[PDB]
Each structure stands twice: as C-alpha cells, then as structure tokens.
Symmetry: D2
Subunit: 251 residues, 4 copies
C-alpha cells in the first residue's frame, strides 16, 4: 500500500456512499483528504469514522457554489498543503424523461452535475498545474455518460457533458506539460444506503437485462478505480473513461 | 426525390451556412421549412433565396429563449400545419480551454448549445408525438461530442451533453411508441463563410493530422445526412450518431 | 432520385434479404449492380426480379474465396465498366458462446466474415483508386461490432474486426487521395425470411430490453443507408459507423 | 500490497517489455506466474530476473499453437495449482496498409493476435469457471482497437476483434455466474527495447499530434492497470476497455 503517498485529495460528496468509500481507501493508501457535503453533522461524523484530522477533515460545500470552491481549495491547502487530487463525485438525479423535465429540474441538476464539475476542474487545473504533484482530476461521469435511460434525461445530459469536457481538460493539461491528468469514472449501479431507500430498485438494477452479473456493485468497487487514477501508477492515463458496471454497457 | 414529401421542418440557425444548406435540400425534397436566426434582414433574404412562402419562411428566434420556442412551434403550425421535423442546428463556440473559460462564457454557450437543444427536443416530443407524422428530431452534436479539443472546453461539454441527452429522448420516444425518432449529426470541419472569416483556419483544419482527407467539407455534406434522418428512409434509426468528418475521428 | 447515377456496384450476398434490398434500391437509383451468392438458381432469379442484365447481373461466389474475388471484379468490369462501389454484405453466424465455439466454427465464420471482407476491401482499393469514380466501400459490421452477445462469440470477433479494419482502410485511402471512402453499416435486428425460419426469434428480438422500438426492422432500412454511403452525397464521410438498430445500442 | 494474494497467472509474451513488467508487478503483489515466449534462453533468464521458481516459471509457447495452450494450462496447474488469471499479451505487428497486406501476412498476424487470444480465452473460461478463484482474463486490445492507423491494417482488424470478442465472453461468464471476468487493456505507445530498435519511432510516437503528453509510456504503465484487473479490487469490472495512452484517443 502507501499507493497515494504524499497526495492531498478533495472528494466532493465524500460524506456518504461512494464518496465516503473513496475517502476511506484514499486515507488507507496514505492520502490526506478533505471531504465535502451539505450537512455538517453527517460530514464531521464521516471524517471521524475514517481517521484523525491529520488524515481527513470535512468542509461544508454545495458543489454548485462557485465562490465556495475557492474557499474549499484554500481550506484544504491550510490543513494539508497543496492539493494534488480532486474527485468530482457530488451529484444529483431527477427521475424524469427529457419530455417531462421541468426547466427548474434541468437547471438544478446541471448546476450540481455539470457547473460544479466545471468549477472544480477549472480551479483544480489552476491550483495543481506546474507544482510537480503528479496531479489527478477524477470526474464522476456514469454509465449514463455512455448510454441513455429514458427516465434520466437531465442526468444523461450532465454525464455526457462531463465525459467529453474532461477530455478537453486532459488534452490542454497534457499539451501544456501541466503535470495534471483528467479522467472519468463510470459506475454502473452500486448499492448505496440511498438505493436501499428505494424499494425494488436493487432488484430492478440486478435483472440480467440491466446488470449481466445479476447483482449491483458496492462503494469500494468505485473506491479502488479512483485509487488507481489518483496514484502515480496511472501517470500515462489521461483523457480516458474507466467503467466499473457489472457488464451493463457491454450488451 | 420528394424524399421529405409532406414533412414540416423547423431548422434553428437556418439562415446561414450549414443550417441554410439543410433548409435548401429540405425544400428541394418537398418539405415545408421554418428557418430561425437572430437577424430578420438575413433570415428573410435567406428564406427568399430558397423558395416562396408556401415552401419556406423565417422566424426570428434565439434558441436559448424558452418562451420563444413555444411561439416558433405555433408560427410553424399556422404557416404549414403540424411540425414533423426539428433540426437543432443553432450553436456558438468559445475559443477557450476549460482552464481559461469564464463563468459568463460557460453559461452563454450552454444556454444556446445545451439549454436550447433541450427546450427544442422537449417541446418537439410534446408537439410531434402520437400524430402519425414519422417525426424526427435531428440534434447537431459535433465531432467535439466524441473527442476533446484543448481550446473548446465549453463547446465539448455542450456537444457531449447533446450526444447522450438525445439517446435518452430516443429511448423514451421508442418505448412509448410516440412515432418520434431522435438522432445526432456530428460534422467535422466544414467551409462556412465564418471559417472564411478566420484567416488560416481552413488550412489548419485541412492538415492530415486533423482531417485525413486533406480538406474540409461543405454545407451540403451536412444537408444530405439530415435529409436521410428527416425522411421515412431512416424509420428504424433512433438513438444513434451520424458522423460526417473527413476521417477526423477515425484516427 | 438518380442518386447513384453512373455507379457500378458489387454487393456480396445480394441474392436474398438485406443484400437483395440494397441491390433493388441501388438499381432504382441508377447504379449497375453485380450481386453475388452461393446458389445460381437463387441468384439468377434474384437479378431478374430487380431488372434487366443491362442493370443487374449475378456472379456465383463464396466471399471467403480469394481467387474468386479477382474473377468477380473482372466479370463486373466486363459487364458494366470500372467498379465504383463495393458492399461487403455476405456473412454467416454461429450461435455459440466463445466458450462453446469449436475451432472449425471459428475458422469457418472468420473465413467469410473477416477474410472475405478483407479480400474485397483490399482488391476494391486497388481496382477503384485514382479513377475519379467517387468510389465507396461499404462493409457490413453489425450492432455486434459495438456490443457483445454471449451467444455470438465468433460473430462479435468478426464484426469488431470489420469495424476497425475499415477505419484503417478509410485513413490510408484519404491520406493518399485515392478517391475511395470506407465506412461501416451496423444493422440491428432485421426481418429476413431467415429470421422467419427461427420460431420465436422475431419476438425475442422485439422485446423492449433488446429493441426499444418494440419491433425489428426491414431490409429496406439497410438499403437506404447504403444508398447514402454509395452516393456522392456522402463524399465527406469516411472511417465512420452508421447504425440502424431501432435503439438497440442506445441503452 | 499483496493485491494478488493467492492468484495464479499465465502471461503470454511475458519474457520481454510489457509482458515482463506485468509479470514483475504480479509477483511483487503475491501472484504465482507462468510467463510464455518463443525462446527458452530469453524466457528462463526473464523468470530468474523476477523471482524463484516457487514465484515464477517459464513455458515455451507460440500463442497461435492451440494444442500448446492445453499443455501451458496443465504445466501452470502442476507448478502452482489452479489458474485464476490469464493475460493474453503476446502479439505481432505488420507495418502494412490493408491495401498492401499479403494474405500470408494477414493469416500470420491473425493466428497470433486473434486466434491465440481466442484459444486462451476459450480455454481459460473452461479451466477457471465455477472454482471460486475470482478469475480474470485480461486481453491486450490496443489503442488500435479504437482508431485506425493507415499502416496497421491487419493489426487494427485483430485488435477490433479482441475488443468485442472479449465483451461476448464477459457477458456469457457474468450471465452464467462463472466467477470469470473478461476485460481489455488498450496501451498507447510504450517504450519497449523493440521501439528502441526502430530509429525515429519514439520521436514520431511523441509528437503532440500523436501522444498529447509529448512522450510515450513505459512497461510499468501497463503492468499497473493489469494488477488492478487481476485483483479482486476489480470484481465489478467486466466487458470493459481500460485505456492507458497518454491522451492518444482523447483527440
Ligand atoms: Mg452531507
Ligand atoms: Mg452548504
Ligand atoms: Mg446496451
Ligand atoms: Mg440570422
Ligand atoms: Mg432574437
Ligand atoms: Mg446552465
Ligand atoms: Mg460510436
Ligand atoms: Mg483521434
Ligand atoms: Mg444464393
Ligand atoms: Mg460458390
Ligand atoms: Mg522469448
Ligand atoms: Mg515455440
Ligand atoms: Mg483466420
Ligand atoms: Mg469507450
């Protein structure tokens, strides 16, 4: 282990589910982590459940909040030193077709899922470039960045945008020798206590016509691909999509 | 010909370049067309250059204008009867990396390229479903929906979003037997009088490392794939990307 | 119409189903056509059902037969003049998983589906380059070139190979200014009298979890995309995949 | 570390370059490894350079040799116990366009790159299914499985075939609860002593129009993604492509 020796990571939406598993494995591999979320009570308990404040801290933030992004990078620097690693994991879903999406639902989802990923990616490049950090921006971009779902219109838009915007950033950073890589992670269906709050959702998600493995994944499935992408093991990977989906997109 | 017999089409940004070539070939194939653009002087001249008002008319519209979308469908209905066909062609570009994109540039581009395509797609589904029209929504989604360009960050975001949002819409329309197809068209570099306004742009675009054919395309190259997608010839095509790029994405 | 004015086309497996529909629409659009198949009785009747020998003829050929490819181009030249257009449509399927595929089944399928497409593409480039024909090689490359099917192991291999081999050919022809385009067509499930010979196959193929439109296509669905790709309308399209699948790959 | 605790791996072409780096990192992570290659002198020295015979051994094999595949699995079992992990890395290249590829060159390359990967994948499924091994088949499938190169016609065919054949295998194994995953790894250009034998090749490969990072990768870049895919860390990944290419395919 020590696969993230000396790394300093921000993980948005790091207080629950997938983001918390990423935070946990990051700390286990020697990273210092700042997790974000909307609720201090959840966030402080989550940080304490992983490690001590010299390993992991919480910062209250809505990823749609442009000015808060600046305060989050400042706070992480103050705690841990220069940020090397950003996981843009925070996101929301609307369970509507394109046809049935209100303009308010459209703008709310895109504010988090697209604007927030843009704000973090843009600031991350500026803060992490040319510092010799082996810097890595890891953007959460979904199986819904590859295929449509008739009931996730706005979500599909946001995840298609993250997929290709990330390639633009990867290229610019590579061509300018910034020592910043940008890649996307594309989870299939994962058992999150949220999924456990939607009766029948896991069974629907586990049908062979959806997930050929016949079950959904766990948060650590996404944590381990994020460790690889944060570490210098992946120093030649940039501009690429990393899919962990139980076969969903293979059929 | 008569490949678009009885079709009624809206083409956004139809007053110039690619949109005007689509309008021209649509009228030649028997469609009735409403073209949109921002400037009445350009739009009325463009409509008259193609045909008489019983074939083609102009409607002044900014595709980012949600309320104007409703007036545009109403006007087209009043002129020509129920709309069967929508080409979401209007778009803008910012020549910035993700890193160098201002929030104002980001929001301006996404308002046209993403929100406008959403507004048109959403309204088109509601207006064209269940009428036996052989309805077709054709969304302009770029080579920049497949690959990054380090100087087109916001554009890449918008075109990745259009690519996958369109698949969501296609699926919902198919599963609900709406008789609406949704597909994307992905131009490579095309000689538009705008390109002719950027000295050196066509030569840059024609380098074999960019366009393997060693030259860029013309507006009619995009018009002909749009005729196919508007016609009942393509009644089994939905949720797919149609690329006309001189080999750009093949290498 | 006259969309294929002056074109001279070879269509392998042109005596039945999809290949015959391509032949029919090619002749309707002004092409001269040589169809191939294994059985003279079927082939001569098929040619006569479409038109007179000044429009369409039959040549008996197994697409796996390298030497016969040379005789087929010679025969087509003798009938109609220089060949401008090749549709590599002939193919076979084995209904086996990778695990359950015999080496004999593997080699038999690849001989037709991969070697035959290679032989035709390679000879087509040599015969059609630098003649000002607006030459077009159209290779049949399947939805099974994009996604796996657990019961089509060898077929998936062959169609993935055709997909990317075609891009190599497209690039070389473009870079060398050969005036030859190479593209792939990717049918979803199509009602062929063969499908009509497999009880339950069409219903299985029409389930929304397979084809979101809830029905399969017809041979003319593939004929019309092939007309576009054969015609000079598609003179800027090369190295690309054209999918006509009822939404199969969109989910 | 111990990320491959208890795993037993076969790595074809494991005596040199990328395959040797995969072998090295596999042994470092606790796997037992059988490397293959054509030359015993190279292979025995390679095994000894990594570890003792209780960690790593060599088996002389041409991956095109169907019967030798059976002897290789038997030998690995005898040395180390049941095989859990197969890396189909052996491959050759022909530096020819499709047009200029001889039939002999075509068949020679496909025998190694396609038939050999098929033989190994097919036998691996049969030997590793239903044993609770957390089994993983990792097939080498190239950037040339995603994009064409005008001078790699047969190579492009083989790597497109491996890409999609692997998805078929992944699906069948998932649906049948075999406890076998199948994934592809897609290197960009990597500095191998072979590349060092082609004067000017690395510089050509490092041009920003080819590899946006402006340099090529090293063998360990491919070793680390293979460790991830062999380990139980990737137990929810199957049917997917893992690209490590310095940005080559992102533009
Ligand atoms: Mg919280
Ligand atoms: Mg807050
Ligand atoms: Mg699918
Ligand atoms: Mg105007
Ligand atoms: Mg206006
Ligand atoms: Mg917005
Ligand atoms: Mg595609
Ligand atoms: Mg490229
Ligand atoms: Mg026949
Ligand atoms: Mg015969
Ligand atoms: Mg050797
Ligand atoms: Mg040998
Ligand atoms: Mg063979
Ligand atoms: Mg991909």
């Amino acid at each position: 282990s020590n696969r993230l020796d000396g790394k300093v990571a921000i993980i948005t939406g790091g207080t629950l589910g997938i983001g918390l598993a990423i935070a946990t494995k990051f700390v286990e591999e020697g990273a210092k982590v700042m997790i974000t979320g909307r609720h201090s009570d959840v966030g402080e308990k989550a940080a304490k459940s992983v490690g001590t404040p010299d390993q992991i801290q919480f910062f209250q933030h809505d990823s749609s909040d442009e000015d808060g992004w600046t305060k989050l990078f400042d706070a992480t620097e103050k705690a841990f030193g220069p940020v090397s690693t950003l996981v843009n994991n925070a996101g929301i879903a609307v369970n509507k077709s394109v046809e049935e999406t209100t303009t308010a639902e459209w703008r709310k989802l895109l504010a988090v899922n697209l604007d927030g990923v843009f704000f973090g990616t843009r600031l991350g490049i500026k803060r992490m470039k040319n510092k010799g950090l082996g810097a890595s921006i890891i953007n959460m971009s979904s199986i819904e960045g590859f295929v449509g779902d008739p009931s996730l219109g706005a979500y599909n838009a946001s995840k298609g945008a993250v997929r290709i915007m990330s390639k633009s950033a990867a290229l610019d950073c590579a061509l300018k020798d910034y020592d910043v890589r940008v890649n996307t992670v594309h989870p299939g269906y994962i058992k999150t206590p949220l999924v456990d709050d939607l009766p029948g959702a896991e069974e629907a998600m586990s049908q062979r016509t959806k997930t050929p493995m016949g079950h959904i994944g766990e948060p650590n499935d996404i944590a381990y691909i994020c460790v690889y992408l944060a570490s210098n093991e992946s120093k030649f990977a940039t501009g690429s999509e990393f899919v962990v989906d139980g076969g969903y997109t293979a059929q």
